[PDB]
Design a protein around this ligand. Sequence first.
Ligand SMILES: [C-]#N
Length: 184
Amino acid sequence: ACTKNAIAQTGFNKDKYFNGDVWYVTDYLDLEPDDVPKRYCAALAAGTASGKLKEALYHYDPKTQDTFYDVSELQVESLGKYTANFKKVDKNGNVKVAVTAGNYYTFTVMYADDSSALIHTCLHKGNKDLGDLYAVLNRNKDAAAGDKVKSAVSAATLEFSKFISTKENNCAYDNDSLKSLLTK
Ligand SMILES: [C-]#N
């Protein structure tokens, strides 16, 4: 279960974050880890599409090869905090699993600037038992986390040394499909 009410970044600039570009997860903190794919890759695009706030997600287990994309319509709870009802899609946006109540994640942007961000998310999917996930994002997939986002981790009363890096996983991304998915 999720336990954190994440605080959104003061002064969060939604138009800069939701600019239709791609964000790569470089480091993440699963508060309730299992015997985890401690090998994971994830990336997302976030943007406004025909007036609608959207996110496209990509997940890839580099060991199992399990792959999936998602498109979501975001609803605003407050500045920097969103509820997203996701649908699973192929890379072209064809629906594989339709939007369904009970399938949603919340997402809070705790810190962001033009190159980096820290987010909190809470996934709800069916009768899955899921917990809080924090993720350090960068505009460049190979960027080591800088002082601004690591300080924000600390300000969140989290330890960055506990975050798991994805950089060792040899991830490759279809950033083109993520951007085009924003419109689907
Ligand atoms: C993925 N939570």
